[PDB]
Each structure stands twice: as structure tokens, then as C-alpha cells.
Amino acid sequence: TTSASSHLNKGIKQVYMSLPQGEKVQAMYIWIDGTGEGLRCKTRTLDSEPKCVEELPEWNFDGSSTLQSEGSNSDMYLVPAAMFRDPFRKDPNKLVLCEVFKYNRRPAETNLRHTCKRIMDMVSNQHPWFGMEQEYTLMGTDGHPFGWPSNGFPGPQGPYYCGVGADRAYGRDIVEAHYRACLYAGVKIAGTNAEVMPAQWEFQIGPCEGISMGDHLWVARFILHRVCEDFGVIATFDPKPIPGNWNGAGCHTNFSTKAMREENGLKYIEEAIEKLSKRHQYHIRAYDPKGGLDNARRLTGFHETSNINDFSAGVANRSASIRIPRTVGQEKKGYFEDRRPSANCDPFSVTEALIRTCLLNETGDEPFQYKN
Amino acid sequence: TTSASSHLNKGIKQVYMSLPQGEKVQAMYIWIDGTGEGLRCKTRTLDSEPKCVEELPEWNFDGSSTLQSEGSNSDMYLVPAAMFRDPFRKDPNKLVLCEVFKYNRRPAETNLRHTCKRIMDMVSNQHPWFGMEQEYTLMGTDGHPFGWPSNGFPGPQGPYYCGVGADRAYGRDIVEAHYRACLYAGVKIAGTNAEVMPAQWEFQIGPCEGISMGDHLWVARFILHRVCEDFGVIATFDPKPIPGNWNGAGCHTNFSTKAMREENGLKYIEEAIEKLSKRHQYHIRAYDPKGGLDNARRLTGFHETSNINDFSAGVANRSASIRIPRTVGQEKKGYFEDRRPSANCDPFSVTEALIRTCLLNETGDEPFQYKN
């Protein structure tokens, strides 16, 4: 149920990692492959510790092995975008998140941060904030949820939500390690909780401003994968990991602006929600790397989920597509939550779509090519 | 499966290694055996920590047990050549790389450093630089790749290159330990990445000047073997560990001179590449410890490899024998990469051949005795 790599003597590894490093510094470059969901990484040595992301040199990789280029001119370029402390190697080593460009310096097909960044710069003075709740399931190497009975099922749902105990919470060690690792690296992690299905969990990122939301979520996803690799388990973001009467996995998004956060900001919240009601199909396509196919298995109108093809909004309503928190409604200010995006969504796509519809008043089935 | 030695209680060993050492210092002598691929080692005690390699005493070993000498005159001599810090015993213990000489003080058959050093001193003013990318595969004690299904195969290639996750990268603990050990010892390690084959990895050494490149690669190979011994796995440099549609293993070499690195040095790069195009058969024989038989199983013109019988060169071409990086071509200066050498090549043999053809303008099938 666990990988063979996880059965190696981990005490041996800790002895080697206790050696003083010296002067040289390791940097790990991370980018998104051609599937729109996978992550890749590799390491290089630097002569001295960088102080800002702009001191890091550019790099390259063979795009033919990642299904991002074919034939000749298969080389692609990595341009650093964000820098974080490395929790797996400690200071002064760093983690670098990069953008992907093809050989003629054009952005890659899966490079969505390029367009999103320019959109955020246009509405900078309004200070948009984002908060995302990421759900996932821990799986064994055999393709079944971690800790589940062999070729069987655990008891019915109800005691696993925010549960405590050996028979109610599976794999809390991964969650605790991931929480501590994110804090060390500088990722703005807000909290965690156990989900309805056993071995299902969730963590929250935010509130983050502008383009920083997409960077923080992707790095948090990488840390989860790397941490799970140490324990020998697999973390999946599939919207419906288990068929039948079991909870799905989504990525709820919280959105707010400076006007929304001020006194009597509830008026602006309702205007934004009204605009969102006119572009249901546009956002469904944007909330999924496959165009909406993955989210169809989850948004069936059951298990506290909204219908895929219907739009609804309400205060303190967890069955609608858009939910206004009861506290926000009473104080006439705050934020609102979008419950449509799936667990495997791209944060750069989700954040950009919200800004276009609500702040730029875009209309139609296609984004505007130039500004606005 | 792993070795029985790896199942011993490693916590017991750490208790003994925590004892203060005292005044005596341990030195490990390392040399190359008669096969041209294997490494041998043994330890002696010194009264005080040596400051330079010049003050290490000479030693000897029985050559009849290593297939390097006859019966009557079996003694061979070890002459220290380089010193490094010992990462397995910590300071002040040392690792010593030595040359092998026969009983009549003549160089051994596999002692290729003696001739390479003299060639290096001939062009010392031009400051040649070398960079080598060494690939390898992690193997279980049962003769099958580590982490692979028993009597089976993993999924098709494509998600393993620079992959992250329990189902995408096998044996990262060895790689992490090896990287830290090389940094502590003083080996000029440049970076690592996961390869197309699962359980296949690669590390880069350089840029190194002259004879230092050969010394640094051999010590890096020794550290990999010693580290893998702790975990109970086997590291192989075989060019084609597994037959079929699986990636091979090579040792790419990057070469540059002082003239090449300066402005408009691309003209010198073209001159060297032109010279290399005339001595294809000479370099193929030199790029393999068996005269080229091993590299025949890998260089078949498939899986981003060049043909064994044909010579080709190009800029940003990963299917040719010689590749010019696109960045180098744009800046009109830099280096070029030779993709012919196999994974089990001798670095002393490879570096010497490049200098002879490109800098000493040698012509023919035999090296020139004395001078160039």
C-alpha cells in the first residue's frame, strides 16, 4: 500500500542531511507541464544565497519529454517568478517557481500566469483578495484510499468530519507535516480540517492579493506532493476519487475588493454576484483544465453541491453556486464564496475569470484580446 | 529487494560513530582495478591530519587479487593524487584518490591519468574546461530496477522525467544523500534531475579545469556506490540496463576553452567541431572501456540519441552527435556538448581525446608518443 522507497531506512538519510552544507546553495526549479495539472522539478547549485527572485538565472529543459514540444526546437525556457524557503533542505536553500516559454520566447500553452498577471496589474488600485480551499484524498500505491479496508469500505459517513481518533482520522501525520512545512516556506496557509469522507482532508490558503494567490496555491500543491512522497502515499486532486455515496472534492474560492471590505460593502457584493449570474457557461469552462468534464462528476446537486448547469445564489446557503456568509450579511461587508471550481482547477484561470467578469465588466464567450 | 546488510539496526552504528575520535586520523585510499570500471578501497591510520596531498605516504596492494598482476611479482604501488574530506566519517578523516603503478614503477594498464596529466600541462595556458553529465539506474539486489513491480513493468514513459510524487520518482533518498555528501567532500557537483526511465537519475559535475575533471568524476562515482551501499541498493552505469522501449544511459561532455568563452568565441567552437568531424572512429573507441561495444547497445538513433556510425552536428539539436546550445549560438560564445560518450566511460580517456583532436591537431588512429 506504500511505495518501496518509503521502506528504506530514513535514519540513514538524516545522518547525511546533518552534514554542514558549506558555501554553495541549492535551488529547486518548479514548473507546470503540458497536462495543465502536473508539476516538474530539478535542482542546480548556486555560488551564493540569492536575496531576491531577480538574482536567479534563467534555465531550460527538454520539452519533448514533457509533451510540451515535438521534433526540433524542443528546448523550452524557465523564467523565475517567485522564491520561497526550502523546507526539505532548510536555509539557505530555496524553492523557485518559474514560467514556461517556448523557443521563440512566446508563452507556453499551459502558461496562464502571463495573461493573468497583466489583468491583475490593470485593477491594482482596487486590491482584489482571494481565498481558496483545496480538498484532496490520500491514496495508497495500490489505487485505493489510504487506510481503507482491503477490497472493502469503512462505515457510513457522519463521524469522519473533523473527527479525532484512530478510527476516525486517517493519515494526520501527512497533514501535520504539510502544515509545518508551508509555514516555514512562507506560504500563507490559513487552516486545515478533516473532510466528510475518511482519508479526505482540506487546507485553506489566503487571503492573498492579486497574482500572489496563484503562486501560493501552486507551491502549496508541490509541498503536499513532496511531503506525501516521503511517507510513500499519493495525494490526488481528482474531483470524484470514489464513485457512489461519497463526498466529492472541490476548490472553493473567496473573492473580495477594497470597496467590498469597507462599510456598507454588501452593495458591491450583490452587484458582483448579479454580473456572475450572466456568465455561468463561461466560468464553468474556465474552472476546469478539460473544459468542465472533470467537474461534471462532482457537481450533481447532491452532498452539499450545486448543479453543474444551474446558477443559484443565497446567504448562508451551502447548496447554491454562490454563498454569502451569514456574518458577512449581518455586518453588511466582507466577501462571498464561489463553490463551483473543482479540486484540480488552475488558480490562475479561476482568479482571472473572476476579475474579468466582476471588475472589467466583460461580456461574451471569449476574453478581450487587449487590455480590459 | 535490498541487501541483508541494509536490514541491520542502523541506530546501533550511530552510537559508535558518536564517540570522540581523538588524535588519530583515518585515510581511505581509492584506486581503479584492472577492469577499468571497478573501484577498490582500504583504510589506514595516520598520526596527524595531513594538510596537503603531498604529505601522504605511499602504499601498496596485492595485484593478483584485482586481476592486475602476475603471481611472482604481484605487488602494486598506490601513489596519492588528490585529497577530499570524508563525508562518511566527517572531519578530520580524508578520502585519497591514487594512481596505480607496477612493481617496476611503470604505469598500470588501466592507469590513464598518467598520460592525460601530461597532455593537460601541454595546453595549460588555454585553460580548457569540462562538464560531464553522469546518468545511472538504481537496481535492487535481485537484478531488477528499484521500485519496479516484481516480474512486471511500470506505466509507459512520459510522466517520470523530472517527476515528483510517490508514483513518479523512485529512490530520491539516495539522490538527496549523494548531493549533500558531494558538497561536503568538495566535489564540484552542479545539479541533479530525474530521467525519463523510472528509477533513473543524473547528476552534473563541472565546470572543471584540466585534470581536475577526471579526479572529481571518479570520486563522485565512489561516493554514489558507498551511499547506495548504506541503503542496500546497487547503482549501475550500464549504457542499456533494460532492453526495449526504455531510455539508455550516457555521459554527455561539455568542452570549452578560454578563446571560446570570450567575445565572438563561436568561431573557435565551429573550428573545433569541424576537427571532430574527421575522427569519428577514433573517438568512438576512446569513449568506451571495451573499445565501443558497450555504447553500441545505446546509440541506435532512437530515444534522443545519435547513430553510432554517423557524425552530425547542429545548434539546439538533441539528436546529433554534437549539440550547440541555443543560448550559446545567440551570444556567439560559450561551449558545445558531445553526446557520444557512454555512461561507463573513463573521464581521463574522454578528456584526453578531446584535447588531442581539438587543441593539439592530432591526425590518425594512434596517439602521438611524446609532445603532440
Place this chain on the structure above:
Amino acid sequence: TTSASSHLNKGIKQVYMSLPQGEKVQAMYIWIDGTGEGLRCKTRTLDSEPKCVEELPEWNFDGSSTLQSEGSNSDMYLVPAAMFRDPFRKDPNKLVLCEVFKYNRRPAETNLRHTCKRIMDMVSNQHPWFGMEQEYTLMGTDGHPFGWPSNGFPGPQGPYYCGVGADRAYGRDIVEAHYRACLYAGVKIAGTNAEVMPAQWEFQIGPCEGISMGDHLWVARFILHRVCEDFGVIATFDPKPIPGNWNGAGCHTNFSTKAMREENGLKYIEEAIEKLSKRHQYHIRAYDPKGGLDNARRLTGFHETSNINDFSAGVANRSASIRIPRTVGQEKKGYFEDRRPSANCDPFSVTEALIRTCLLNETGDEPFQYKN
């Protein structure tokens, strides 16, 4: 394969060993039993740390349980002879090597240090030096070499001598722990190496002066047994642990005097060798605890060994009974090596026999009763 005691939780033991000791000091007494090969030990508490071996009190043990005494008068006496730091309990605890005397204060049958010490004092002005190479094999609790295939054999010899790798060296953890323990205790250990047969190793002790050589070897043997006990394996000194085409185990002895070590000392080396050629049968009996029967299984004239019936000497000859190193012959000074003694020899017997023949010019088959 490994003992049941080795499967206990070793982390539990370290917690207890971390408790501060206090004022009392533990002392472990070690002696040789009636078989002439076995070692025994027990511990007592002392009120304060002793500074010299002469401060240690005498002790006693029941000789009927060690096959050394009669029925009615079973008590034997332990007289401390040498003191060392305890590597298993750390400072200020000590290890004590003792001599055995009968109830009437006469030396025991296996007590050979008593006569050897008096012989040593007779030639103290010549400063004899000794160096011994102890070979041994690591065995599992099932009676087979450690790491060997169950009911099978590994590959043919040749890659195991001074080998590195998971498939070439078995049980290096024991060797590393033993090396550090000897250094901490103060035993003059000179170096180690892997032997021809897999799971066979060797360590060197010396150069030691006079009676101190026998004390250091016996304590080194005790530390090896105690270290192997922690890992759950057995170390055997049997001359021929495995029948067939597998390497034997011996104890080569290096001998020199202050005259041999000075300039033109090679002349003195030859004279000693000629004297040794006259008493071949006398030394064969003295080199084995059983009278020569054990060494008969090893010294068969093959596997770089000399024949048990014939005496031969030569320079740089590993097939002769006496070997002169090539370096010694060139510099006309140094030492010579005796390759006859078996791996289970008593160092006190071996050192005494060399002095009697070479320095006291003794002749005949019996030692001289009083002095020389």
C-alpha cells in the same frame, strides 16, 4: 540469521544509557578460559575512577564453570594486567584485562602471558616491535556466512577483495563500528580492508613494543565479539570457515628490532630468517592453540598460502612462509613478515617463540626452563 536479542528495540536502551551515571564507576574484567580461545567477562562497581592499573583490586571466579579447575578447589584468581577506556559505556568506565592463577597462586594452564612477559624483559634493550594482521569471517546465527544466499553460494572470487558496493562488501557496519571503538579504547589499530571471500575482513594492530602487543590484540578481539553481539552476528577466527575454493584465515606477524630498523639493518633481518629456517616444526606447534591441527586445513600451498610441511623465504613473495617487503629490501632496513600463524593463534605464544629463536638463539624442541 540474526539473534533474537538483536531484534529488541535498541532505542529503548539508548534512553537508559543517557542517564547521568553519578559518582560510581563500572569496571569489566576480561580473561581467557580453558580452551585457549574463548573470552569471559563480568562487571563490578568501584567507588572512584582509577588512574592506573595498579589501583584495581584483585578478583576471583569459579573455575569449575569455565573448565579450568578441579572440584574441591574451584576458585581461581584474576590479577589485572592492562586497563583501557570502555567504548560501550564511555568514560569514566574501564576495561580490565587480567591474568588467571590457580588457588595456590600458580599460573593457569592457559596463562601464557606470565612466561612471555619475563622473556620480553630479557631483551628489553633491543626494543622488539610486532604487528599482526587478524582475519575473521562474519557468520549468521544459522551457521552460514553473513549475507550469503540461503543454502547457496555467491559468485566466484575476484570482485570482493577491497570491494565497494551492496553486492561486493557484506557487513561493513560492523567493521566501521569496530574501528571507532578500538580508537576510543586506546587500542593501536592500524587499518582495515575487505578480504577475498565475501563477508571476510581483516584489521591490523601495531607496531607494538614487547608484551604490549599481546594485550592489544586480545582486547581488540574482545571488542569485535562485543560489537558483533549488538548487531546479532557471530565473528569466527576459524582458519578454514568454508571448505572448498574459498580463502582461508590467518594471522600474519611482522617482526623487527632496533638493529633491523637502523641503516643497513637488512643484514640483521637475514640472520634472523636463517635461524627461523632451523625450527620449522617448533614454530608450527607454537602457532596453533591445538598443536598445529587447525592450521593444517588452511596451509595447503594454495590461495596465496605456504605449505605446512615446507619452509621457504623470499623478498616480495606472498607464497613463502617468510616474506620480505620489496620496500624493505630496497631501503636495506625495516621488518619481515611471518605468514605461518593461523587466525586463532595466541599472540603471547607467537611473540615468545619469535624472540626465543631469533634473539636468544635457542635450539631444540623444548623452551629453556630458566631464562635462555
Place this chain on the structure above:
Amino acid sequence: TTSASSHLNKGIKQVYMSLPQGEKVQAMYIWIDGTGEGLRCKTRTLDSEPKCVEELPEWNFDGSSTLQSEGSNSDMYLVPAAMFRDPFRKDPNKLVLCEVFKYNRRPAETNLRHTCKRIMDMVSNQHPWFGMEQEYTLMGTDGHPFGWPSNGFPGPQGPYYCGVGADRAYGRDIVEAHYRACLYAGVKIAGTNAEVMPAQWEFQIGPCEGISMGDHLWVARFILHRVCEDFGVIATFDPKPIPGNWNGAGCHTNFSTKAMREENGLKYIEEAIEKLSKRHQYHIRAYDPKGGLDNARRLTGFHETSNINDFSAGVANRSASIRIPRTVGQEKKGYFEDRRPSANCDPFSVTEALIRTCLLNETGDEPFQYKN
């Protein structure tokens, strides 16, 4: 990977089964559940061995437990249709295949034999003959193909088709037992062969005339499931059990009547095919129990398969929708093969659709509701 029931001592059961039955006769009733592809069985005791199916008494069962009815009129009825000798209990025990009728004596939703029997009685003068090649995959209790590596894949396809050997044929014990059982029971089984991917097999039923063909295939499916129960494995009829470069499963149907079986009947084959070319979509709907949502994963136009959206025909063309054997073309008489129906097809639906289009000259989208 195998069921716990299969680990019981089968020798004990054989002792009981050898007891003389006496005079009573056991009868097993078999019917199709509400899913349209599952089977249910029940056993009753008869006073004497029946000589024909016409004298077997009717029975009943609870439709609520079988999801063929709600909680008000859950009771259903079973009417015997065919009788066969029992291979699992031997003579004189028998197997009975029955039709399902509602409480109001109307055929159930999944009872397709009622309408099919009426249709083929109309064209009984032409004597239509049918032959279907049924494919299936053997799977363990863990949901993985039987004999496959744990969490892995076997070698690439090519040696498994009609293979022999421990590494080429998986689970030949089941197919041999099923073949012998079908012959004993009286099912018109024609032959078996191993398929392209390992653990996949195929058997052929026919040439069966009239409504008997639908009866024979359903009984053959029941015997396969019952036989696999003894060995503890699961037989599945999914069209695409394993995604990727692995062969799918289908049910090729061979059709002919007296016209094509006579001389120069090749023209009768041609006119029937050209009629089938018009109603491509209609037959696709009726060839799948789910309307075509299952066969879409198999008919992808690769691995020697025809595209689901394209109709084609040809002589000895295995990539077309309809295949005419080369022998049939050269002999100008015989039959034609339909490669469209999936493995989990209903035999009654498949035979009925072929009769309507090719013999009754029907057209449109809905079947012709009345008799004439």
C-alpha cells in the same frame, strides 16, 4: 487476489458430493435481473426427474430485492423456457432458464425474449442461423486482471494471442473447465482461443438456429460465472476493462439464413449488408445495454477496430464494421460477420435487430410495434 471461499478445503466438499442423491431431483432456476446484464439463481427440490421443460412448475421471487419492482407489488413470476443438464451437480439434476413476468402477467422491462421469440417465428421459414464470439477478462477480487503484476503491467502485446506457456496464457484452468461443463450441459459451444491481451479469452457459440441461440449464450454466461466462483476469480464482460494500449472486448455476431447458404448466395449477403448500411445508428443503440455509452470506449478506430461513427464493409477486412470471410467470397456462399456489438450485449436484442432490418425490410428509428 482470490476470494476467501476459494481457500476452503475443496476435498471436504467432494466427499459430500459423492453421497448417493437418492430419488429427489434438484432444479436451478436462472433469470435476468433489472440491470439487464446480471443473473440470479435459486434451487428447489422436485419429486421426479422431468423429461421436458414443458412440465416444470412455475415459481416466483421478490422483485424489490432485485430492483425489478417497488414495495407494493414486488412479487414477480418465473416461467421456464429452456432446460439443460446440471454440470455442477451431475445427472439427474437440471438447470432451468426462465422468463420474468410482472404481477399483472406482463413481461418485465428486461424481458426481451418475449418480443424476440414472436419476431423470429415470422421468418422461421428461412431458418436464420447465428454465431457469436463472446470475449471476457478474468479478474481477481481486487479489481485487477488475474495474473498481472501487483500495481504493474505485463510485457507489450504480441505474444499472448493464442499463446501457450506459463508466461503467455493466464488462467487456462478456468477455460478448460468451462468448455467441458458446457459440453456436458448441452450448450452448443464451438471453440475457444486466447486473446491479444493476457488474461483475456473468448469462446464461440453456434451455429444455433432460431430463438435457441439467445438461450444458449445466456446459459453459457451463467456457467462461466459459476465456474469462476469455484476458483475464486471474477469474469467480467466490460468492453474496455483496461484503458490504454490494451485490447478491448466485443461480441462478434455471425449471421446467415438458407438463402446465403445455398449456391451463389454471395449476392444475398451483399443485399443484406447494403440494407444494414442505412441503419448504422439504430443498430449501435441496440448493440449496447446502455445505448452505446459503453461501446464508445472500444470502437476508437485503433487496435484493428472500426470507428463507432463510421460504417464500412469489405472482404477479409478486420478493420471494417462488417467482414466477409475470404473463403466465403471465393466460394460465393456462406455468412457474414458483424463486429459492432460489445461484450456485454444482450443476445435477444442483437438477434432481433438483425432479423428486422435484413429480413423484414424495416426502416426508421423506432422498432415496428405491431405484428404485421
Place this chain on the structure above:
Amino acid sequence: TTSASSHLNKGIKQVYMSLPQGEKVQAMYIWIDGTGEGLRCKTRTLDSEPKCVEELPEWNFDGSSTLQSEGSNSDMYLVPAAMFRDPFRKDPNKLVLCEVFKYNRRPAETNLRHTCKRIMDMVSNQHPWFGMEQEYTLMGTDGHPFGWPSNGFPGPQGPYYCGVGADRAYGRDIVEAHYRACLYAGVKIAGTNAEVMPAQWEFQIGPCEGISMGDHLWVARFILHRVCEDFGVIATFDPKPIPGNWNGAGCHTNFSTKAMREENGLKYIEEAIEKLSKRHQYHIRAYDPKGGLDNARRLTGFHETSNINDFSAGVANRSASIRIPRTVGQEKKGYFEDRRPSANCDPFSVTEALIRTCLLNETGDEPFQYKN
């Protein structure tokens, strides 16, 4: 080490196989695939037991899945050639060996029986007799010889040849079962013996006359594969399964005509030997399915064999290319043995080459056309 199919309850299968067959008869069709080394099989049902092979109808198969045809004309044909009793299903079921023809009724590339049958019909009066000693090695599913220690080797050779005992003969159950099955089926099997290395055996077929030799050997190979499938082991015909000091596998051929079988026929043997002397390279090419790339690893001139590039002959000389039995020389009448062909040789190729060189006096490196 054994297949998962072999762990199924074989008692269950025996219960089903004991059911009376009835009246139908099963026939198994066997043919050689495109590799020229493997075999393929499938089963059909017959309405009655055929008295002779001439009553068996023709059949067909998909050549694309067998690697014998492309996708355009993948269909191939099977023509029965010989019939044998089925030992795995008992009477009246049959095994049939069939020839393979293309769609245009031409022999396939691997169909060497067609031309072989024509050649042997031209020397019918001489009545050539053949006897081949076929050697093979039993292997586990992990690629290691059956019964060998895991990741290890057994003792040195010498006791395993024709040995008896649990430690000397590995897998005699397969040998005994195969011997009994061959006798039941009608294969002219002459005897068996254990070979030099463990888990290696040999059986002898003959003396068969004419084309009968090729049919019997191929059927015997099929029975061996089928029998080994029941036990879960793999039979290998590789000439050198294990490199090193382990014996190889070959197929010695014994040849004689009526002239050599008459009085003073030793001279006729001698004329045949000298005719075989000047066509050594031609026969070596035809004695291997790959032209000699396999037999080169066995005929190294060691382990009592002959060199690949040298021709030799002699009486009772087992190290020569051709051996004449001492008893044959003593009686001046008999046969001669060819020790050149490898274990994986094609009997049709071997018999044809011997006939056309010794009895038809062919010369050159190419076989004669219709002229011979």
C-alpha cells in the same frame, strides 16, 4: 517464482474434467508463429472423431496478431499435416500440427516444412533416419533457473549429471509427466537424462524416418510447454541461459541411411563426413534460427565442446564437431552424430541441410533450386 495460475486449486479442475464428454470431439490446432521459435494454439469442436488427418477441415487465424502479416491481408490459413492423441484431454480428442499459408496460398516465411517435404521425397529409397537430443532448462517466472538459490548459485558442477536426490535433480516431476504424455500421444520418444548443470534436462526423439522427424520434435516441444504451464514453470531453449562456468544447451542430431546401416557401412559414413567438411559455414548458418548469433555463445571450445570457427571429427571424440560412436567404429556399421546445432534449432532446417549435402552433393553458399 511460480505463476499465479499454478496456485489455483487443481482439484477443482479434475472434478470438471471427469464429466463424460458426450459425443462431440475437441481438436487443437498448432502452428509456428512469425518468430520461427514459438508456437500458437486454438481449439475447435468436431461432430465426430476423425480417423485420419486427411479428414480434418482447414481453418484460419489473424496473422497481424501473430506478427506474420500486415493489416491489409492479415488473414492466413492453416492446413493440417499430422494428428496425435490429446494427452491433456484424453481420447477421443486430438492434437493436429498445421502448415501456414499466406492469403495467396503461398507458404509463409517460417513455413519451412513445405520445401523440406519436397526434398526428402527425392531420397525416399535411401530411407534416411534422424534422431535429435533436445536439451532445455527449467526456469521460474522471475527469470532464474528453477530451484536455484535466490540471487545465488548452487555448488560447482559434477554431481548433477544424471544425478538422483533432492539436492542433485531439480524438477523431475515435469520430466516424468512429459515422458508419459509423449508416449500416450504417440511421439517417438527414446529416453531422458539429467544434464550437467542443475535444472537442465534432455530428451531424445527418434529414430524417425523422413519428414516424420520434424513433426514429432515440434509436437514434443508443444507438449513440454503445455505440461510446464500446469506446474507454473517456463521451459527455455536458449543455447546459453546462464553465462559463466555453466553448461550450455544444444540439439545433437544423429543421421544415417540404409547404406550406413548395412554391412561395412562405416565407409559410407566416412564419405558423408568429408562432404560435411567443406560446408562448415553453410551448415552453421542453417543450424541457428538467427543465423549463428545464438550458437556463438555456446560453441566456445570449452566445457567439452567444439569451437564455432573450426571443423573436427573423430571416433568417440566428444569435443569434435562430428562424433562417430566407438561401438559404430568397432562394428564398422551404424550412424554418426552432429553436435553443431543449437537447442533452439528448427528441425526442418536441420534435416533438409543434412540431406542435400550428404545425399545430393550440393555445393556453394546457397541452396539449389528445382534442379535439386
